[PDB]
Nucleic acid binder design. Structure first.
Length: 559
RNA sequence: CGCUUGCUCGGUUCGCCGAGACUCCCCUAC
DNA sequence: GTAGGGGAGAATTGGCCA
DNA sequence: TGGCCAATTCT
Protein backbone atom coordinates (compact mmCIF):
# COMPACT_ATOMS: atom_id res chain seq x y z
CA UNK A 1 0.00 0.00 0.00
CA UNK A 2 1.66 3.20 -1.21
CA UNK A 3 1.68 5.86 1.50
CA UNK A 4 4.40 8.32 0.46
CA UNK A 5 3.79 11.69 -1.23
CA UNK A 6 7.11 13.38 -2.05
CA UNK A 7 7.02 17.10 -2.84
CA UNK A 8 7.43 18.88 -6.17
CA UNK A 9 8.27 22.58 -5.91
CA UNK A 10 7.30 25.10 -8.60
CA UNK A 11 8.04 28.79 -9.06
CA UNK A 12 5.57 31.68 -9.15
CA UNK A 13 5.59 33.76 -12.34
CA UNK A 14 2.94 36.45 -11.81
CA UNK A 15 0.68 37.65 -9.00
CA UNK A 16 -1.90 40.35 -8.34
CA UNK A 17 -0.64 41.60 -4.97
CA UNK A 18 1.82 40.07 -2.49
CA UNK A 19 0.44 37.06 -0.64
CA UNK A 20 0.97 38.82 2.70
CA UNK A 21 -1.86 41.20 1.74
CA UNK A 22 -4.30 38.44 0.79
CA UNK A 23 -7.34 38.13 3.10
CA UNK A 24 -6.59 34.45 3.74
CA UNK A 25 -3.14 35.29 5.14
CA UNK A 26 -4.61 38.04 7.33
CA UNK A 27 -7.30 35.73 8.71
CA UNK A 28 -4.72 33.02 9.42
CA UNK A 29 -2.47 35.54 11.18
CA UNK A 30 -5.31 36.85 13.34
CA UNK A 31 -6.62 33.41 14.28
CA UNK A 32 -3.12 32.23 15.18
CA UNK A 33 -2.45 35.34 17.26
CA UNK A 34 -5.70 34.90 19.18
CA UNK A 35 -5.43 31.15 19.76
CA UNK A 36 -1.78 30.97 20.80
CA UNK A 37 -2.29 33.55 23.56
CA UNK A 38 -5.18 32.49 25.81
CA UNK A 39 -5.35 30.40 28.96
CA UNK A 40 -6.40 26.77 29.28
CA UNK A 41 -9.84 27.66 30.66
CA UNK A 42 -10.36 30.19 27.87
CA UNK A 43 -9.20 27.64 25.29
CA UNK A 44 -11.71 25.12 26.65
CA UNK A 45 -14.40 27.80 26.46
CA UNK A 46 -13.22 29.09 23.07
CA UNK A 47 -13.27 25.65 21.47
CA UNK A 48 -16.70 25.57 19.81
CA UNK A 49 -15.42 26.67 16.39
CA UNK A 50 -16.89 23.55 14.80
CA UNK A 51 -16.82 22.68 11.11
CA UNK A 52 -19.92 24.46 9.78
CA UNK A 53 -20.94 27.93 8.66
CA UNK A 54 -23.40 28.24 11.56
CA UNK A 55 -20.53 27.49 13.98
CA UNK A 56 -17.80 29.47 12.21
CA UNK A 57 -19.87 32.66 12.11
CA UNK A 58 -20.76 32.47 15.80
CA UNK A 59 -17.15 31.70 16.76
CA UNK A 60 -15.92 34.69 14.75
CA UNK A 61 -18.71 36.84 16.22
CA UNK A 62 -18.40 36.17 19.95
CA UNK A 63 -14.59 36.10 19.88
CA UNK A 64 -14.23 39.27 17.82
CA UNK A 65 -11.42 38.06 15.54
CA UNK A 66 -11.69 40.08 12.29
CA UNK A 67 -12.80 37.95 9.35
CA UNK A 68 -11.26 40.38 6.80
CA UNK A 69 -13.97 39.45 4.30
CA UNK A 70 -12.91 35.79 4.18
CA UNK A 71 -15.86 33.43 4.69
CA UNK A 72 -14.96 30.21 2.83
CA UNK A 73 -15.75 27.38 5.24
CA UNK A 74 -13.45 24.84 3.59
CA UNK A 75 -10.39 27.08 3.91
CA UNK A 76 -11.24 28.36 7.38
CA UNK A 77 -11.55 24.84 8.80
CA UNK A 78 -7.93 24.07 7.90
CA UNK A 79 -6.71 27.28 9.54
CA UNK A 80 -8.63 26.76 12.77
CA UNK A 81 -7.73 23.07 13.09
CA UNK A 82 -4.05 23.82 12.53
CA UNK A 83 -4.03 26.67 15.06
CA UNK A 84 -5.69 24.60 17.77
CA UNK A 85 -3.40 21.63 17.09
CA UNK A 86 -0.34 23.87 17.35
CA UNK A 87 -1.73 25.19 20.64
CA UNK A 88 -2.28 21.64 21.94
CA UNK A 89 1.09 20.39 20.76
CA UNK A 90 3.13 22.27 23.36
CA UNK A 91 1.02 20.70 26.11
CA UNK A 92 1.59 17.19 24.79
CA UNK A 93 5.31 17.86 24.28
CA UNK A 94 5.61 18.77 27.95
CA UNK A 95 3.38 15.82 28.81
CA UNK A 96 5.56 13.29 27.03
CA UNK A 97 8.57 14.74 28.82
CA UNK A 98 6.92 14.41 32.21
CA UNK A 99 5.96 10.78 31.48
CA UNK A 100 9.64 10.07 30.84
CA UNK A 101 10.28 11.18 34.43
CA UNK A 102 7.09 9.60 35.80
CA UNK A 103 8.01 6.20 34.44
CA UNK A 104 11.46 6.36 35.99
CA UNK A 105 9.94 7.31 39.35
CA UNK A 106 7.45 4.44 39.13
CA UNK A 107 10.20 1.94 38.33
CA UNK A 108 12.35 3.21 41.21
CA UNK A 109 9.39 3.04 43.61
CA UNK A 110 8.41 -0.50 42.58
CA UNK A 111 12.04 -1.68 42.79
CA UNK A 112 12.38 -0.18 46.27
CA UNK A 113 9.09 -1.77 47.35
CA UNK A 114 10.30 -5.14 46.07
CA UNK A 115 13.59 -4.63 47.94
CA UNK A 116 11.74 -3.24 50.97
CA UNK A 117 12.98 0.34 50.73
CA UNK A 118 10.29 3.03 51.05
CA UNK A 119 9.28 4.76 47.80
CA UNK A 120 11.22 7.92 47.01
CA UNK A 121 9.55 11.32 46.75
CA UNK A 122 8.27 11.96 43.23
CA UNK A 123 9.86 14.85 41.38
CA UNK A 124 7.53 17.76 40.52
CA UNK A 125 6.00 17.58 37.05
CA UNK A 126 6.87 20.50 34.78
CA UNK A 127 3.95 22.33 33.18
CA UNK A 128 3.70 24.71 30.23
CA UNK A 129 1.48 27.19 32.13
CA UNK A 130 2.96 29.99 34.21
CA UNK A 131 1.46 32.18 36.92
CA UNK A 132 -0.37 34.28 34.30
CA UNK A 133 -2.24 31.20 33.04
CA UNK A 134 -0.80 31.40 29.52
CA UNK A 135 1.81 29.15 27.92
CA UNK A 136 5.45 29.98 28.60
CA UNK A 137 6.33 28.79 25.07
CA UNK A 138 3.86 30.44 22.70
CA UNK A 139 3.91 28.93 19.19
CA UNK A 140 4.83 31.37 16.44
CA UNK A 141 2.67 32.50 13.51
CA UNK A 142 3.37 30.75 10.20
CA UNK A 143 3.55 32.41 6.80
CA UNK A 144 1.89 29.53 4.97
CA UNK A 145 -1.23 29.54 2.79
CA UNK A 146 -2.95 26.17 2.43
CA UNK A 147 -5.04 25.77 -0.71
CA UNK A 148 -8.29 23.80 -0.91
CA UNK A 149 -10.55 22.30 -3.55
CA UNK A 150 -12.39 25.47 -4.61
CA UNK A 151 -9.02 27.12 -5.33
CA UNK A 152 -7.31 24.13 -6.94
CA UNK A 153 -4.85 24.73 -9.79
CA UNK A 154 -6.17 24.85 -13.36
CA UNK A 155 -4.49 25.49 -16.71
CA UNK A 156 -4.21 29.14 -17.69
CA UNK A 157 -6.84 30.26 -20.19
CA UNK A 158 -7.17 33.83 -21.53
CA UNK A 159 -10.90 33.23 -22.07
CA UNK A 160 -11.42 32.92 -18.29
CA UNK A 161 -8.32 34.43 -16.63
CA UNK A 162 -6.50 37.79 -16.53
CA UNK A 163 -4.28 38.55 -19.50
CA UNK A 164 -0.55 37.97 -19.02
CA UNK A 165 2.54 38.36 -21.23
CA UNK A 166 2.79 34.57 -21.62
CA UNK A 167 0.16 32.25 -23.07
CA UNK A 168 -0.81 28.71 -22.14
CA UNK A 169 -1.07 25.66 -24.39
CA UNK A 170 -4.29 23.75 -25.03
CA UNK A 171 -4.90 21.53 -21.96
CA UNK A 172 -5.90 18.59 -24.15
CA UNK A 173 -3.04 18.98 -26.62
CA UNK A 174 0.22 17.17 -25.81
CA UNK A 175 2.74 19.17 -23.82
CA UNK A 176 5.54 20.75 -25.89
CA UNK A 177 8.74 18.76 -26.23
CA UNK A 178 12.25 20.12 -25.89
CA UNK A 179 14.73 20.25 -28.75
CA UNK A 180 14.07 17.20 -30.96
CA UNK A 181 17.60 16.98 -32.40
CA UNK A 182 19.99 19.29 -30.57
CA UNK A 183 22.80 18.32 -32.96
CA UNK A 184 21.04 20.05 -35.88
CA UNK A 185 20.95 23.56 -34.38
CA UNK A 186 23.01 25.81 -36.70
CA UNK A 187 25.82 28.10 -35.64
CA UNK A 188 24.33 31.37 -34.46
CA UNK A 189 21.21 29.80 -32.95
CA UNK A 190 20.88 29.19 -29.19
CA UNK A 191 21.74 25.68 -28.07
CA UNK A 192 24.48 25.16 -30.66
CA UNK A 193 26.79 22.24 -29.87
CA UNK A 194 30.35 22.93 -31.12
CA UNK A 195 32.14 20.37 -33.26
CA UNK A 196 34.90 19.47 -30.79
CA UNK A 197 32.45 18.52 -28.02
CA UNK A 198 30.41 16.30 -30.36
CA UNK A 199 32.36 13.03 -29.78
CA UNK A 200 32.12 13.54 -25.99
CA UNK A 201 28.37 13.31 -25.44
CA UNK A 202 26.53 11.19 -22.88
CA UNK A 203 24.69 8.20 -24.32
CA UNK A 204 22.25 7.60 -21.46
CA UNK A 205 18.97 9.43 -20.76
CA UNK A 206 20.53 12.47 -19.15
CA UNK A 207 18.19 15.29 -18.19
CA UNK A 208 18.21 17.99 -20.87
CA UNK A 209 19.13 21.52 -19.80
CA UNK A 210 18.00 24.40 -21.98
CA UNK A 211 20.47 27.04 -23.09
CA UNK A 212 18.72 29.60 -20.87
CA UNK A 213 19.18 27.48 -17.74
CA UNK A 214 21.11 29.76 -15.41
CA UNK A 215 23.12 26.78 -14.20
CA UNK A 216 24.84 27.08 -17.59
CA UNK A 217 25.63 30.78 -16.99
CA UNK A 218 26.15 30.96 -13.21
CA UNK A 219 29.09 32.69 -11.57
CA UNK A 220 32.02 30.26 -11.61
CA UNK A 221 35.75 30.84 -11.02
CA UNK A 222 36.78 29.67 -14.49
CA UNK A 223 34.04 30.76 -16.90
CA UNK A 224 34.78 34.28 -18.23
CA UNK A 225 31.24 34.15 -19.64
CA UNK A 226 28.65 36.87 -19.01
CA UNK A 227 25.34 36.43 -17.19
CA UNK A 228 22.47 38.61 -18.41
CA UNK A 229 19.54 37.71 -16.18
CA UNK A 230 16.98 39.70 -18.18
CA UNK A 231 17.67 37.81 -21.42
CA UNK A 232 17.54 34.45 -19.65
CA UNK A 233 14.26 35.36 -17.92
CA UNK A 234 12.63 36.58 -21.14
CA UNK A 235 13.81 33.46 -22.98
CA UNK A 236 12.49 31.16 -20.24
CA UNK A 237 9.10 32.87 -19.95
CA UNK A 238 8.24 32.24 -23.62
CA UNK A 239 8.17 28.45 -23.14
CA UNK A 240 6.73 28.10 -19.63
CA UNK A 241 3.75 25.87 -18.87
CA UNK A 242 1.50 28.19 -16.83
CA UNK A 243 -1.08 27.10 -14.27
CA UNK A 244 -3.31 29.42 -12.25
CA UNK A 245 -4.83 29.43 -8.75
CA UNK A 246 -7.56 31.95 -7.89
CA UNK A 247 -8.67 32.59 -4.29
CA UNK A 248 -11.33 35.28 -4.18
CA UNK A 249 -10.29 38.24 -6.32
CA UNK A 250 -6.57 37.38 -6.13
CA UNK A 251 -4.57 34.92 -8.21
CA UNK A 252 -1.10 33.52 -8.82
CA UNK A 253 0.37 31.87 -11.92
CA UNK A 254 3.08 29.22 -11.60
CA UNK A 255 5.48 27.36 -13.89
CA UNK A 256 4.38 23.73 -14.17
CA UNK A 257 7.77 22.67 -15.57
CA UNK A 258 8.81 21.58 -12.08
CA UNK A 259 5.93 19.11 -12.09
CA UNK A 260 7.01 17.94 -15.55
CA UNK A 261 10.59 17.33 -14.43
CA UNK A 262 9.37 15.53 -11.30
CA UNK A 263 7.15 13.23 -13.34
CA UNK A 264 9.90 12.59 -15.92
CA UNK A 265 12.87 11.78 -13.70
CA UNK A 266 10.71 9.49 -11.53
CA UNK A 267 9.54 7.38 -14.48
CA UNK A 268 5.81 7.94 -13.98
CA UNK A 269 4.73 9.49 -17.29
CA UNK A 270 6.48 9.18 -20.64
CA UNK A 271 7.05 12.21 -22.90
CA UNK A 272 4.10 13.35 -24.99
CA UNK A 273 1.39 13.76 -22.34
CA UNK A 274 -0.90 16.76 -21.90
CA UNK A 275 -1.18 19.35 -19.14
CA UNK A 276 -4.50 17.99 -17.87
CA UNK A 277 -3.08 14.70 -16.60
CA UNK A 278 0.17 16.39 -15.57
CA UNK A 279 -1.86 18.31 -12.98
CA UNK A 280 -3.69 15.05 -12.27
CA UNK A 281 -0.62 13.33 -10.82
CA UNK A 282 -0.58 15.78 -7.89
CA UNK A 283 -3.10 16.80 -5.26
CA UNK A 284 -5.27 19.85 -5.74
CA UNK A 285 -4.11 21.34 -2.43
CA UNK A 286 -0.74 23.07 -2.86
CA UNK A 287 1.03 24.93 -0.06
CA UNK A 288 2.19 28.51 -0.59
CA UNK A 289 4.92 30.37 1.27
CA UNK A 290 5.10 34.08 0.38
CA UNK A 291 8.73 34.43 1.49
CA UNK A 292 10.22 32.36 -1.35
CA UNK A 293 7.50 32.43 -4.01
CA UNK A 294 7.45 28.65 -4.31
CA UNK A 295 4.42 26.35 -4.39
CA UNK A 296 5.03 22.92 -2.86
CA UNK A 297 2.84 20.44 -4.69
CA UNK A 298 2.64 16.96 -3.19
CA UNK A 299 2.36 13.82 -5.30
CA UNK A 300 -1.02 12.12 -5.31
CA UNK A 301 -1.39 9.07 -3.07
CA UNK A 302 -0.47 6.28 -5.47
CA UNK A 303 1.68 8.09 -8.02
CA UNK A 304 4.88 6.76 -6.40
CA UNK A 305 4.93 3.04 -5.61
CA UNK A 306 6.64 3.45 -2.23
CA UNK A 307 5.55 1.89 1.06
CA UNK A 308 7.35 3.78 3.81
CA UNK A 309 8.97 1.66 6.52
CA UNK A 310 11.00 2.18 9.68
CA UNK A 311 14.41 0.68 10.55
CA UNK A 312 13.84 -2.65 12.27
CA UNK A 313 15.75 -3.99 15.27
CA UNK A 314 16.55 -7.39 16.72
CA UNK A 315 14.16 -10.26 16.07
CA UNK A 316 11.84 -8.14 13.92
CA UNK A 317 14.67 -8.03 11.37
CA UNK A 318 14.60 -11.83 11.29
CA UNK A 319 10.83 -11.87 10.78
CA UNK A 320 11.09 -9.20 8.07
CA UNK A 321 13.71 -11.07 6.05
CA UNK A 322 12.01 -14.44 6.53
CA UNK A 323 8.91 -12.76 5.10
CA UNK A 324 10.90 -11.24 2.22
CA UNK A 325 12.83 -14.36 1.19
CA UNK A 326 9.54 -16.24 0.83
CA UNK A 327 8.34 -13.69 -1.73
CA UNK A 328 11.28 -14.07 -4.13
CA UNK A 329 13.80 -16.90 -4.57
CA UNK A 330 16.63 -14.33 -4.49
CA UNK A 331 17.20 -11.64 -1.85
CA UNK A 332 20.29 -9.43 -1.74
CA UNK A 333 22.03 -8.00 1.32
CA UNK A 334 24.64 -5.36 2.05
CA UNK A 335 26.54 -4.81 5.31
CA UNK A 336 27.79 -1.29 5.98
CA UNK A 337 30.95 -0.74 8.02
CA UNK A 338 31.03 3.05 7.94
CA UNK A 339 34.14 4.40 9.63
CA UNK A 340 36.98 2.15 8.39
CA UNK A 341 39.58 4.26 6.54
CA UNK A 342 36.82 5.11 4.03
CA UNK A 343 33.30 6.54 4.34
CA UNK A 344 31.53 3.29 3.35
CA UNK A 345 32.53 -0.37 3.12
CA UNK A 346 29.96 -2.79 1.71
CA UNK A 347 29.72 -6.55 2.28
CA UNK A 348 27.47 -8.08 -0.37
CA UNK A 349 25.59 -11.35 0.06
CA UNK A 350 22.42 -13.21 -0.88
CA UNK A 351 19.73 -14.84 1.27
CA UNK A 352 18.20 -18.24 0.45
CA UNK A 353 15.56 -20.51 1.98
CA UNK A 354 16.76 -23.87 3.29
CA UNK A 355 13.23 -24.55 4.47
CA UNK A 356 13.43 -22.19 7.45
CA UNK A 357 17.09 -21.15 7.32
CA UNK A 358 18.76 -17.89 6.28
CA UNK A 359 21.57 -19.38 4.23
CA UNK A 360 23.99 -16.75 2.94
CA UNK A 361 26.86 -16.81 0.44
CA UNK A 362 29.11 -13.74 0.05
CA UNK A 363 29.59 -12.31 -3.44
CA UNK A 364 32.41 -9.89 -2.71
CA UNK A 365 33.33 -6.67 -0.93
CA UNK A 366 33.62 -3.14 -2.33
CA UNK A 367 34.46 0.38 -1.21
CA UNK A 368 33.37 3.74 -2.58
CA UNK A 369 35.09 4.82 -5.82
CA UNK A 370 37.94 7.31 -5.88
CA UNK A 371 35.96 10.14 -7.51
CA UNK A 372 33.20 9.97 -4.89
CA UNK A 373 35.77 9.91 -2.08
CA UNK A 374 37.44 12.87 -3.80
CA UNK A 375 34.11 14.73 -3.68
CA UNK A 376 33.69 13.88 0.01
CA UNK A 377 37.22 15.09 0.74
CA UNK A 378 36.58 18.33 -1.16
CA UNK A 379 33.51 18.88 1.01
CA UNK A 380 35.48 18.50 4.25
CA UNK A 381 38.25 20.82 3.03
CA UNK A 382 35.48 23.41 2.59
CA UNK A 383 33.62 22.62 5.82
CA UNK A 384 36.73 23.05 7.98
CA UNK A 385 37.33 26.41 6.31
CA UNK A 386 33.75 27.33 7.31
CA UNK A 387 33.86 26.41 10.99
CA UNK A 388 37.25 28.11 11.08
CA UNK A 389 35.62 31.46 10.29
CA UNK A 390 32.35 30.83 12.15
CA UNK A 391 34.59 30.87 15.24
CA UNK A 392 37.49 33.20 14.39
CA UNK A 393 35.38 36.31 13.79
CA UNK A 394 32.59 35.16 16.13
CA UNK A 395 34.58 34.83 19.36
CA UNK A 396 36.38 38.11 18.61
CA UNK A 397 33.03 39.89 19.08
CA UNK A 398 34.08 40.07 22.74
CA UNK A 399 32.70 42.18 25.62
CA UNK A 400 36.29 42.99 26.76
CA UNK A 401 35.90 40.99 29.99
CA UNK A 402 34.41 37.62 28.99
CA UNK A 403 37.62 36.48 27.27
CA UNK A 404 39.15 34.88 30.37
CA UNK A 405 36.48 32.23 30.88
CA UNK A 406 36.36 30.88 27.30
CA UNK A 407 38.76 32.33 24.73
CA UNK A 408 42.18 32.85 26.29
CA UNK A 409 41.75 30.07 28.86
CA UNK A 410 42.17 27.84 25.81
CA UNK A 411 45.42 29.72 25.17
CA UNK A 412 46.59 28.87 28.69
CA UNK A 413 45.56 25.27 27.97
CA UNK A 414 48.81 25.00 26.01
CA UNK A 415 50.59 27.68 28.06
CA UNK A 416 49.65 27.43 31.74
CA UNK A 417 49.09 23.66 31.90
CA UNK A 418 58.69 14.64 30.28
CA UNK A 419 58.48 10.89 29.77
CA UNK A 420 55.24 11.36 27.82
CA UNK A 421 54.92 13.83 24.93
CA UNK A 422 52.75 15.86 27.40
CA UNK A 423 50.00 16.04 24.75
CA UNK A 424 49.70 12.50 23.37
CA UNK A 425 47.17 10.57 25.45
CA UNK A 426 48.81 7.86 27.60
CA UNK A 427 46.16 6.40 29.90
CA UNK A 428 46.95 4.18 32.90
CA UNK A 429 50.68 4.75 32.38
CA UNK A 430 52.89 6.26 35.08
CA UNK A 431 55.04 8.17 32.56
CA UNK A 432 53.57 11.45 33.85
CA UNK A 433 54.70 10.83 37.42
CA UNK A 434 57.90 9.07 36.31
CA UNK A 435 59.40 12.33 35.03
CA UNK A 436 57.56 14.49 37.57
CA UNK A 437 58.96 12.53 40.52
CA UNK A 438 62.34 12.25 38.82
CA UNK A 439 62.77 15.82 40.14
CA UNK A 440 60.40 15.61 43.11
CA UNK A 441 59.47 13.50 46.11
CA UNK A 442 55.82 12.30 46.09
CA UNK A 443 54.63 15.91 46.33
CA UNK A 444 53.41 18.63 43.97
CA UNK A 445 51.01 21.57 43.91
CA UNK A 446 48.11 19.08 43.80
CA UNK A 447 47.53 15.44 44.75
CA UNK A 448 45.35 12.53 43.64
CA UNK A 449 43.68 11.15 46.81
CA UNK A 450 40.85 9.78 44.66
CA UNK A 451 38.83 6.62 45.29
CA UNK A 452 39.02 5.39 41.72
CA UNK A 453 38.17 2.04 40.18
CA UNK A 454 35.49 -0.64 40.30
CA UNK A 455 36.26 -1.24 43.96
CA UNK A 456 37.15 2.45 44.33
CA UNK A 457 40.81 1.80 45.07
CA UNK A 458 42.56 4.59 46.96
CA UNK A 459 44.87 5.37 44.04
CA UNK A 460 47.34 7.96 45.32
CA UNK A 461 50.66 6.16 44.75
CA UNK A 462 53.45 8.19 43.11
CA UNK A 463 50.79 10.76 42.09
CA UNK A 464 50.42 9.17 38.66
CA UNK A 465 47.97 11.33 36.68
CA UNK A 466 44.42 12.67 36.10
CA UNK A 467 44.71 15.00 39.11
CA UNK A 468 47.57 17.26 38.05
CA UNK A 469 46.25 17.39 34.47
CA UNK A 470 42.77 18.21 35.81
CA UNK A 471 44.16 20.99 38.03
CA UNK A 472 46.34 22.18 35.20
CA UNK A 473 44.60 25.12 33.52
CA UNK A 474 41.17 23.63 32.66
CA UNK A 475 38.21 24.60 30.53
CA UNK A 476 36.49 25.21 33.90
CA UNK A 477 33.11 25.16 32.09
CA UNK A 478 32.44 28.75 33.18
CA UNK A 479 29.94 30.87 31.23
CA UNK A 480 30.24 28.50 28.28
CA UNK A 481 26.70 28.96 26.96
CA UNK A 482 26.39 32.75 26.67
CA UNK A 483 29.95 33.36 25.46
CA UNK A 484 30.31 30.42 23.05
CA UNK A 485 27.15 28.53 22.17
CA UNK A 486 24.73 31.45 21.84
CA UNK A 487 27.08 33.60 19.74
CA UNK A 488 28.35 30.82 17.48
CA UNK A 489 24.91 29.28 16.95
CA UNK A 490 23.41 32.70 16.21
CA UNK A 491 26.06 33.31 13.55
CA UNK A 492 25.59 29.76 12.21
CA UNK A 493 22.22 30.58 10.63
CA UNK A 494 23.35 34.03 9.43
CA UNK A 495 26.10 33.14 6.94
CA UNK A 496 24.92 31.99 3.52
CA UNK A 497 27.69 29.37 3.29
CA UNK A 498 26.58 27.36 6.33
CA UNK A 499 23.02 26.96 5.01
CA UNK A 500 24.44 25.58 1.74
CA UNK A 501 27.08 23.27 3.22
CA UNK A 502 24.49 21.28 5.18
CA UNK A 503 22.43 20.68 2.04
CA UNK A 504 25.62 19.73 0.20
CA UNK A 505 26.46 17.26 2.98
CA UNK A 506 23.02 15.68 2.72
CA UNK A 507 23.34 15.47 -1.07
CA UNK A 508 26.75 13.79 -0.85
CA UNK A 509 25.53 11.28 1.74
CA UNK A 510 22.54 10.45 -0.47
CA UNK A 511 24.93 10.04 -3.41
CA UNK A 512 26.96 7.50 -1.44
CA UNK A 513 23.78 5.67 -0.43
CA UNK A 514 22.44 5.61 -3.99
CA UNK A 515 25.73 4.27 -5.34
CA UNK A 516 25.76 1.52 -2.71
CA UNK A 517 22.16 0.59 -3.57
CA UNK A 518 22.91 0.49 -7.31
CA UNK A 519 26.00 -1.62 -6.75
CA UNK A 520 24.04 -3.95 -4.51
CA UNK A 521 21.46 -4.36 -7.25
CA UNK A 522 24.23 -5.13 -9.74
CA UNK A 523 26.50 -7.49 -7.82
CA UNK A 524 23.77 -9.54 -6.12
CA UNK A 525 21.75 -9.66 -9.36
CA UNK A 526 18.55 -8.99 -7.43
CA UNK A 527 15.80 -6.37 -7.54
CA UNK A 528 14.61 -6.88 -3.92
CA UNK A 529 17.56 -5.89 -1.72
CA UNK A 530 18.01 -5.15 1.98
CA UNK A 531 20.37 -3.06 4.10
CA UNK A 532 21.93 -3.87 7.48
CA UNK A 533 23.76 -1.14 9.41
CA UNK A 534 25.27 -1.61 12.88
CA UNK A 535 25.45 1.47 15.12
CA UNK A 536 32.88 13.21 10.33
CA UNK A 537 30.55 11.62 7.79
CA UNK A 538 29.33 8.94 10.21
CA UNK A 539 26.17 10.65 11.44
CA UNK A 540 25.05 11.93 8.04
CA UNK A 541 25.78 8.62 6.31
CA UNK A 542 23.85 6.76 9.01
CA UNK A 543 20.87 9.10 8.63
CA UNK A 544 20.99 8.85 4.83
CA UNK A 545 21.03 5.05 4.91
CA UNK A 546 18.27 5.09 7.55
CA UNK A 547 16.11 7.44 5.45
CA UNK A 548 15.56 4.81 2.75
CA UNK A 549 12.99 3.07 4.95
CA UNK A 550 10.78 6.18 4.93
CA UNK A 551 11.59 7.84 1.60
CA UNK A 552 12.00 4.75 -0.59
CA UNK A 553 10.68 1.84 1.48
CA UNK A 554 13.88 -0.20 1.38
CA UNK A 555 14.17 -2.36 4.52
CA UNK A 556 16.95 -1.37 6.91
CA UNK A 557 18.27 -3.46 9.81
CA UNK A 558 19.90 -1.82 12.83
CA UNK A 559 22.56 -3.99 14.46
C1' C B 1 13.17 2.58 -22.54
C1' G B 2 12.58 7.94 -20.36
C1' C B 3 13.57 14.55 -19.35
C1' U B 4 11.99 22.62 -21.07
C1' U B 5 12.00 25.77 -15.24
C1' G B 6 14.70 25.77 -10.09
C1' C B 7 19.01 23.80 -6.90
C1' U B 8 24.64 21.31 -5.75
C1' C B 9 29.50 20.15 -7.56
C1' G B 10 32.86 20.33 -11.79
C1' G B 11 35.16 20.76 -17.46
C1' U B 12 35.68 24.96 -21.58
C1' U B 13 38.08 26.82 -27.37
C1' C B 14 33.12 31.13 -23.53
C1' G B 15 28.99 28.55 -28.41
C1' C B 16 27.56 24.48 -24.04
C1' C B 17 28.22 19.89 -21.28
C1' G B 18 30.00 16.09 -17.80
C1' A B 19 28.17 14.36 -13.00
C1' G B 20 24.66 14.45 -8.57
C1' A B 21 20.25 15.30 -5.02
C1' C B 22 14.96 15.25 -5.04
C1' U B 23 10.90 14.54 1.70
C1' C B 24 9.86 19.09 2.33
C1' C B 25 7.90 23.16 5.25
C1' C B 26 7.24 26.34 9.32
C1' C B 27 7.68 26.36 15.07
C1' U B 28 9.59 26.91 20.52
C1' A B 29 13.70 25.45 23.01
C1' C B 30 18.35 23.55 24.39
C1' DG C 1 23.61 19.16 17.01
C1' DT C 2 19.89 18.03 16.00
C1' DA C 3 15.26 17.46 19.59
C1' DG C 4 10.13 17.46 19.18
C1' DG C 5 5.58 19.45 18.54
C1' DG C 6 2.47 21.16 14.20
C1' DG C 7 1.60 20.82 8.54
C1' DA C 8 1.41 19.00 3.35
C1' DG C 9 -7.61 15.69 0.50
C1' DA C 10 -11.44 15.09 -2.09
C1' DA C 11 -15.93 12.89 -2.94
C1' DT C 12 -20.76 13.76 -2.46
C1' DT C 13 -24.63 16.90 -1.66
C1' DG C 14 -27.48 21.08 -1.87
C1' DG C 15 -28.92 25.73 -3.15
C1' DC C 16 -29.23 27.47 -7.18
C1' DC C 17 -30.64 30.99 -11.13
C1' DA C 18 -30.57 30.04 -16.26
C1' DT D 1 -32.76 20.50 -17.54
C1' DG D 2 -28.23 22.18 -16.19
C1' DG D 3 -24.90 24.45 -14.82
C1' DC D 4 -21.51 26.73 -11.56
C1' DC D 5 -19.73 26.28 -7.01
C1' DA D 6 -19.90 26.65 -1.91
C1' DA D 7 -20.67 23.43 2.01
C1' DT D 8 -20.99 19.20 4.06
C1' DT D 9 -18.16 15.26 5.59
C1' DC D 10 -15.45 11.42 5.94
C1' DT D 11 -10.59 10.00 5.99
Amino acid sequence: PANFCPPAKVNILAQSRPLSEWPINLVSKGVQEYVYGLTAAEREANGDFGTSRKSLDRWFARTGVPTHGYTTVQGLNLILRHTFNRYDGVIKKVETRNEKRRSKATRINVSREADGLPPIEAEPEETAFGPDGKLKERPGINPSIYCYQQVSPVPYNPAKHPALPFSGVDPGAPLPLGTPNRLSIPKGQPGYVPEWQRPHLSTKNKRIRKWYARANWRRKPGRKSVLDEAKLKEAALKEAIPIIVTIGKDWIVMDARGLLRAVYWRGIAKPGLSLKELLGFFSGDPVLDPKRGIATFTFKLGAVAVHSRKPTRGKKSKELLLSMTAEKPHVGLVAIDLGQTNPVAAEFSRVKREGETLQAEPLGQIVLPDDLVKDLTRYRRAWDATEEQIKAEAIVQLPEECRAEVVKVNQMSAEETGDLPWEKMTSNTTFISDHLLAKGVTDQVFFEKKSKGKKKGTETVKRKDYGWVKLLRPRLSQETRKAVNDKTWELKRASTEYVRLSRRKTELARRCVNYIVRETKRWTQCEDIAIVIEDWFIQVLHKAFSDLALHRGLPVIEA
